[PDB]
Write a protein that holds these residues in place. Structure first.
Motif, PDB file in Angstrom:
ATOM      1  N   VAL A  20       0.825  -1.207   0.000  1.00 24.19           N
ATOM      2  CA  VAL A  20       0.000   0.000   0.000  1.00 24.19           C
ATOM      3  C   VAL A  20       0.863   1.263   0.000  1.00 24.19           C
ATOM      4  CG1 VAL A  20      -0.352  -0.134   2.533  1.00 24.19           C
ATOM      5  CG2 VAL A  20      -1.928   1.157   1.106  1.00 24.19           C
ATOM      6  N   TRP A  21       1.917   1.294   0.814  1.00 23.97           N
ATOM      7  CA  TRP A  21       2.798   2.449   0.914  1.00 23.97           C
ATOM      8  C   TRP A  21       4.226   1.966   0.718  1.00 23.97           C
ATOM      9  CZ3 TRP A  21       3.733   5.928   5.870  1.00 23.97           C
ATOM     10  CH2 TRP A  21       4.440   7.071   5.481  1.00 23.97           C
ATOM     11  N   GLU A  22       4.965   2.637  -0.166  1.00 25.65           N
ATOM     12  CA  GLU A  22       6.316   2.189  -0.479  1.00 25.65           C
ATOM     13  C   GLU A  22       7.319   2.711   0.539  1.00 25.65           C
ATOM     14  OE1 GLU A  22       4.110   3.603  -2.360  1.00 25.65           O
ATOM     15  OE2 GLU A  22       3.939   2.677  -4.337  1.00 25.65           O
ATOM     16  N   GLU A  23       7.137   3.950   0.995  1.00 24.41           N
ATOM     17  CA  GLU A  23       8.007   4.566   1.989  1.00 24.41           C
ATOM     18  C   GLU A  23       7.510   4.352   3.412  1.00 24.41           C
ATOM     19  OE1 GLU A  23       7.041   5.817  -0.831  1.00 24.41           O
ATOM     20  OE2 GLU A  23       8.803   6.524  -1.925  1.00 24.41           O
ATOM     21  N   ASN A  24       6.749   3.288   3.657  1.00 22.74           N
ATOM     22  CA  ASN A  24       6.303   2.985   5.010  1.00 22.74           C
ATOM     23  C   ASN A  24       7.459   2.446   5.842  1.00 22.74           C
ATOM     24  OD1 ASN A  24       5.309   0.545   6.875  1.00 22.74           O
ATOM     25  ND2 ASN A  24       3.728   2.136   6.905  1.00 22.74           N
ATOM     26  N   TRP A  25       7.624   2.998   7.043  1.00 19.58           N
ATOM     27  CA  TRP A  25       8.700   2.594   7.937  1.00 19.58           C
ATOM     28  C   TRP A  25       8.319   1.435   8.848  1.00 19.58           C
ATOM     29  CZ3 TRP A  25      12.294   6.989  10.043  1.00 19.58           C
ATOM     30  CH2 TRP A  25      12.645   7.843   8.997  1.00 19.58           C
ATOM     31  N   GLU A  26       7.031   1.109   8.956  1.00 18.81           N
ATOM     32  CA  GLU A  26       6.588   0.063   9.867  1.00 18.81           C
ATOM     33  C   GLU A  26       6.833  -1.342   9.335  1.00 18.81           C
ATOM     34  OE1 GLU A  26       5.350   0.843  13.013  1.00 18.81           O
ATOM     35  OE2 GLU A  26       6.122   2.792  12.360  1.00 18.81           O
TER      36      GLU A  26
ATOM     37  N   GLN B   5      14.680  -7.008  10.313  1.00 21.19           N
ATOM     38  CA  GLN B   5      15.084  -6.226  11.473  1.00 21.19           C
ATOM     39  C   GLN B   5      16.588  -6.357  11.660  1.00 21.19           C
ATOM     40  OE1 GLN B   5      12.797  -5.347  15.675  1.00 21.19           O
ATOM     41  NE2 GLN B   5      13.579  -7.425  15.352  1.00 21.19           N
TER      42      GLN B   5
ATOM     43  N   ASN C 243      18.122  -2.558  15.820  1.00 20.58           N
ATOM     44  CA  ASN C 243      16.698  -2.568  16.130  1.00 20.58           C
ATOM     45  C   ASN C 243      16.267  -3.856  16.826  1.00 20.58           C
ATOM     46  OD1 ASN C 243      14.890  -0.207  14.511  1.00 20.58           O
ATOM     47  ND2 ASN C 243      17.022  -0.467  13.861  1.00 20.58           N
TER      48      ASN C 243
ATOM     49  N   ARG D 208      14.366  -3.388  20.311  1.00 24.29           N
ATOM     50  CA  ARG D 208      13.031  -3.912  20.591  1.00 24.29           C
ATOM     51  C   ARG D 208      13.027  -4.820  21.816  1.00 24.29           C
ATOM     52  NH1 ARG D 208       9.507  -4.079  16.609  1.00 24.29           N
ATOM     53  NH2 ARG D 208       7.446  -5.040  16.877  1.00 24.29           N
TER      54      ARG D 208
ATOM     55  N   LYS E 135      -5.905  -4.134   0.423  1.00 24.29           N
ATOM     56  CA  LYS E 135      -4.586  -3.649   0.023  1.00 24.29           C
ATOM     57  C   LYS E 135      -4.562  -3.285  -1.455  1.00 24.29           C
ATOM     58  CE  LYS E 135      -1.494  -5.919   3.334  1.00 24.29           C
ATOM     59  NZ  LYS E 135      -0.347  -4.985   3.176  1.00 24.29           N
TER      60      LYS E 135
ATOM     61  N   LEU F 118      -6.547  -0.003  -1.962  1.00 25.48           N
ATOM     62  CA  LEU F 118      -5.840   1.164  -1.447  1.00 25.48           C
ATOM     63  C   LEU F 118      -4.651   1.529  -2.329  1.00 25.48           C
ATOM     64  CD1 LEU F 118      -6.057   0.349   2.318  1.00 25.48           C
ATOM     65  CD2 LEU F 118      -7.263   2.179   1.163  1.00 25.48           C
ATOM     66  N   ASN F 119      -3.912   0.525  -2.819  1.00 26.07           N
ATOM     67  CA  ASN F 119      -2.830   0.798  -3.763  1.00 26.07           C
ATOM     68  C   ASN F 119      -3.372   1.421  -5.042  1.00 26.07           C
ATOM     69  OD1 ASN F 119      -0.055   0.328  -5.076  1.00 26.07           O
ATOM     70  ND2 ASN F 119      -1.412  -0.919  -6.355  1.00 26.07           N
TER      71      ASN F 119
ATOM     72  N   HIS G 217      -2.124   3.919   6.285  1.00 25.00           N
ATOM     73  CA  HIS G 217      -0.957   3.802   5.410  1.00 25.00           C
ATOM     74  C   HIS G 217      -1.236   4.406   4.038  1.00 25.00           C
ATOM     75  CE1 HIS G 217       0.877   1.718   8.550  1.00 25.00           C
ATOM     76  NE2 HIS G 217       1.150   0.552   7.993  1.00 25.00           N
TER      77      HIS G 217
ATOM     78  N   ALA H 241       0.511   7.780   2.325  1.00 24.95           N
ATOM     79  CA  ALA H 241       1.079   7.834   0.978  1.00 24.95           C
ATOM     80  C   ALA H 241       0.464   8.973   0.169  1.00 24.95           C
ATOM     81  CB  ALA H 241       0.871   6.500   0.265  1.00 24.95           C
TER      82      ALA H 241
ATOM     83  N   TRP I 162       8.064   1.152  22.736  1.00 30.07           N
ATOM     84  CA  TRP I 162       8.469   0.952  21.345  1.00 30.07           C
ATOM     85  C   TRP I 162       7.590   1.743  20.391  1.00 30.07           C
ATOM     86  CZ3 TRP I 162      12.492  -0.473  18.701  1.00 30.07           C
ATOM     87  CH2 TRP I 162      12.352  -0.786  17.345  1.00 30.07           C
TER      88      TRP I 162
ATOM     89  N   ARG J 190       8.611   4.796  17.914  1.00 33.03           N
ATOM     90  CA  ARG J 190       8.287   4.898  16.495  1.00 33.03           C
ATOM     91  C   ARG J 190       7.518   6.182  16.194  1.00 33.03           C
ATOM     92  NH1 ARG J 190       5.993  -1.014  14.818  1.00 33.03           N
ATOM     93  NH2 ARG J 190       4.844  -0.685  16.770  1.00 33.03           N
TER      94      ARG J 190
ATOM     95  N   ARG K 162      10.054   8.845  16.170  1.00 25.02           N
ATOM     96  CA  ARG K 162      10.823   8.707  14.940  1.00 25.02           C
ATOM     97  C   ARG K 162      10.082   9.323  13.759  1.00 25.02           C
ATOM     98  NH1 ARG K 162      12.499   2.666  13.718  1.00 25.02           N
ATOM     99  NH2 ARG K 162      10.280   2.571  13.166  1.00 25.02           N
ATOM    100  N   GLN K 163       8.772   9.079  13.669  1.00 25.64           N
ATOM    101  CA  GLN K 163       7.966   9.702  12.621  1.00 25.64           C
ATOM    102  C   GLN K 163       7.908  11.215  12.793  1.00 25.64           C
ATOM    103  OE1 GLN K 163       6.964   8.240   9.947  1.00 25.64           O
ATOM    104  NE2 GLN K 163       7.202   6.080  10.509  1.00 25.64           N
TER     105      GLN K 163
ATOM    106  N   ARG L 163      10.965  12.526  11.521  1.00 22.76           N
ATOM    107  CA  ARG L 163      10.924  12.384  10.069  1.00 22.76           C
ATOM    108  C   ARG L 163      10.183  13.543   9.417  1.00 22.76           C
ATOM    109  NH1 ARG L 163       7.466   7.758   6.736  1.00 22.76           N
ATOM    110  NH2 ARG L 163       8.079   8.461   4.645  1.00 22.76           N
TER     111      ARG L 163
END
Lengths: 203, 27, 402
Positions: free
Chosen positions: B4-10, B15, B19, B23, C263, C266-267, C304, C308, C377, C381, C384-385, C388
């Motif tokens: 769905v998202w190419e630049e998704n960090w999740e 790993q 990381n 974790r 998916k 959405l894509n 997600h 995007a 955690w 994250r 971190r975002q 970003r």
């Protein structure tokens, strides 16, 4: 009011809200209004057309029909709703069958819904269905009618008991079907030869 | 398959060691 | 040569174990050698034509022919042999094996790919067996994945006609998957308005089955993005609304197939928005409307997709931020296990949406995190975002807390 906004919009966000409500009700049913909406639109359709205006906005009409079909298939035990569903579909298709309407995606959607709903019930008799199928093949056309008849015969064979066969007539019907190459041929043969010992080798 | 998202960090199928320890350190 | 003669000798033996071993060795050597390939091609022709061979051994023998791609004339002779095979052995197993072998041979030897596609379409439209049809679907999928440009307008016309005519849901799903795979390449340009493909895609996008709808709306998305013809601009609304219908259908189904279809949808809308900004606005609107009532995993995937959308297209509207904040508030006391990924994705869309600095809404976010998360955690994250997207004050607060 429900019918008023319907007859006002077509000849926008409230349709989306209706879709959200339909989805939430479906979620409640599966985890645990459609009748009222269907009755309201049927009563509106009885009065003078709505289908013509819906055709130009088929992109918004078709999701409602799909949600209604999902609701129907979700609760097969709930009889009566399917009968009204099929009646409304047949009536609105008949009102839409004139050649001057420029039939399109909504036409195909209604046709497939009607065919699927009609296949959902049994047929009266195997021999009568076979004779009607033979008559249709003698007419050489009406392949939609032929498809409905063969689906009904397959459903009856799946459910009911074997009846009088007339093996010459069965061979003639299969020869006609092979002549027209019906898509349901393999299903029909599987239906026949999974039962009805009254001889398959000869056929 | 598609994402769905190419630049998704999740996306955490891969790993790294840093990381991995991070974790495990606080979970 | 002596090894080749040993392979050839054992192929006509009596012990079935030796014959099967000879078949395997013939496969390998024909993969390697060239002269051995034509010799074995001739022997297999005269053997399958022979009556001594049993049916199972004939089944085992046919895929040897997939290695006859060493030269053009050998491949053509193998093609004649396979045509003879499908004519004179019409039962299910060996037509399956033979036409699959023909597909592989045509894939290897590019000269005969058009006639192979034509033959596959002929078997798809005419043959009544479900298994043969499904193999035809798989072989066309392989050819589309391996050589979309070779496809002609006539082949796509035939495939669309086959899709329209067939009543079975599985066959329709498979052939529409083949069509969707074709649509994501240059095959659309070679195909070209309102035609059979457009009518099929519109009809299938409103089909009851989830997969058929997904593949139909993907065909519409590809055809809209690829070219800017007038009828495509007319029908682009149809794609959007069908996509919304699929979204509302899959927003609470909660099954792996539903997850896959969601998916895909959405894509598709991400790509459509990358192509059509004026459509992207309504795409954002419907995404926000369905975000509130969707399930947790559906919300994660929706977030997600929205991230995007926002990342690629800058002018998303700060009116989004209110809905996202409201959704973030209620989710604060939703669950414990799947709440984590939903929280981090929601925080991500919050940061991406906030092109400017934050406000007391950041205080609400950190208060919700400190009260409900108790995990760290996810806090890491989210920080971190924040770093970003440039919301560095939020990152400072979270890192100090962590």
């Amino acid at each position: 009011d429900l019918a008023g906004m319907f007859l006002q919009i077509f000849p926008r966000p409230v349709a989306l809200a209706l879709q959200q409500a339909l989805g939430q009700e479906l979620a409640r049913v599966v985890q645990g209004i459609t009748v009222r909406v269907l009755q309201a639109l049927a009563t509106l359709l009885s009065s003078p057309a709505l289908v013509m205006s819906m055709h130009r906005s088929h992109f918004l009409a078709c999701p409602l029909l799909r949600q209604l079909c999902q609701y129907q298939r979700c609760v097969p035990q709930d009889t009566g709703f399917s009968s009204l569903f099929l009646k409304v579909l047949l009536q609105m298709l008949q009102w839409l069958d004139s050649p001057g309407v420029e039939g399109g995606p909504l036409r195909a959607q209604l046709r497939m819904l009607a065919s699927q709903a009609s296949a959902g019930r049994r047929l009266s008799d195997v021999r009568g269905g076979l004779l009607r199928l033979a008559e249709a093949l003698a007419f050489r056309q009406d392949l939609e009618v032929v498809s409905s008849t063969v689906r009904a015969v397959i459903a009856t064979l799946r459910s009911g008991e074997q009846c009088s066969v007339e093996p010459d007539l069965i061979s003639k019907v299969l020869q006609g079907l092979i002549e027209v190459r019906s898509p349901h041929l393999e299903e029909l043969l599987t239906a026949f030869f999974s039962a009805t010992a009254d001889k398959p080798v000869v056929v | 398959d598609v994402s769905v998202w190419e630049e998704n960090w999740e996306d955490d199928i891969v790993q790294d060691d840093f990381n991995q320890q991070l974790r495990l350190e606080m979970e | 040569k002596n090894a080749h003669h040993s392979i050839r000798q054992s192929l006509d033996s009596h012990d079935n174990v030796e014959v099967e071993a000879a078949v395997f060795a013939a496969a390998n050597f024909s993969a390697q050698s060239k002269d051995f390939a034509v010799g074995i091609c001739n022997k297999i022709s005269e053997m399958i034509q022979g009556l001594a061979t049993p049916v199972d051994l004939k089944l085992k023998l046919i895929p040897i022919l997939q290695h006859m791609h060493h030269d053009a004339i050998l491949a053509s002779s193998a093609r004649q042999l396979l045509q003879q095979l499908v004519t004179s052995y019409p039962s299910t197993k060996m037509v399956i094996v033979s036409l699959h072998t023909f597909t592989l041979l045509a894939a290897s030897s590019l000269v005969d790919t058009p006639k192979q596609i034509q033959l596959l379409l002929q078997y798809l439209k005419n043959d009544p067996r479900k298994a043969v049809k499904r193999l035809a679907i798989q072989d066309l999928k392989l050819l589309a994945n391996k050589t979309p440009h070779t496809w002609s307008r006539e082949n796509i016309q035939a495939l669309c006609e086959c899709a329209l005519q067939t009543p079975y849901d599985s066959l329709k799903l498979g052939m529409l998957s083949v069509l969707s795979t074709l649509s994501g390449t240059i095959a659309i340009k070679h195909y070209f308005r309102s035609s059979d493909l457009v009518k099929l895609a519109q009809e299938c996008c409103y089909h009851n089955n989830r997969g058929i709808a997904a593949h139909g709306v993907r065909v519409l998305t590809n055809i809209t993005v690829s070219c800017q013809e007038k009828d495509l601009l007319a029908l682009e609304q149809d794609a959007v609304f069908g996509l919304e219908s699929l979204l509302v259908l899959c927003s609470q189904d909660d099954s792996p197939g539903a997850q896959a279809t969601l998916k895909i949808a959405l894509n598709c809308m991400v790509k459509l928005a990358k192509g059509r900004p004026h459509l992207s606005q309504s795409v954002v609107e419907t995404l926000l409307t369905q975000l509130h009532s969707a399930q947790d995993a559906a919300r994660i995937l929706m977030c997600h997709c929205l991230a995007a959308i926002a990342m690629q297209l800058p002018v998303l509207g700060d009116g989004m931020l209110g809905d996202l904040m409201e959704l973030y508030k209620v989710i604060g006391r939703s669950a414990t296990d799947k709440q984590q990924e939903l929280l981090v994705s929601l925080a991500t869309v919050i940061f991406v949406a906030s092109q400017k600095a934050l406000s007391v809404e950041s205080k609400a976010v950190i208060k919700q995190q400190l009260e409900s998360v108790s995990n760290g955690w996810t806090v890491y994250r989210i920080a971190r975002q924040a770093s970003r997207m440039g919301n560095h004050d939020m990152a400072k607060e979270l890192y100090q807390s962590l």
